[PDB]
């Protein structure tokens, strides 16, 4: 039983620690990912409204 306590303990420790680190870095990457995707989508909408303005012309 003494051996088991360290096996399962190591498993849970590694899982939980890497999950916390994974969530942190996931937010860290999502920062810029959302920023750049929103920028590109906005610019596309800008050109779309330019075309709409040509129709209005």
């Amino acid at each position: 039983s003494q051996t088991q306590g360290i096996q399962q303990l190591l498993q849970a420790e590694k899982r939980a620690a890497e999950k916390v680190a994974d969530a942190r870095k996931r937010k860290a990457r999502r920062l810029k990912q959302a920023k750049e995707e929103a920028q590109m989508e906005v610019e596309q909408y800008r050109r779309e409204r330019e075309q709409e303005f040509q129709s209005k012309q």
Partner: protein
């Protein structure tokens, strides 16, 4: 008052018994190193079933 006493005091004894234990670092179970009679072990495991 008397039954209140018996309940409270046996509760005290129960908690004292819990105090004599071994809390693992992370495991939520308690591991004991205790004694036990051999001849009545069937009644002991019956009490565990209870």
């Amino acid at each position: 008052i008397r039954v209140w006493f018996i309940k409270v005091r046996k509760m005290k004894a129960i908690y004292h018994t819990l105090n004599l234990c071994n809390i693992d670092v992370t495991q939520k179970c308690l591991i004991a190193e205790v004694w036990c009679p051999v001849t009545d072990l069937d009644s002991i495991q019956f009490a565990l079933r209870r």
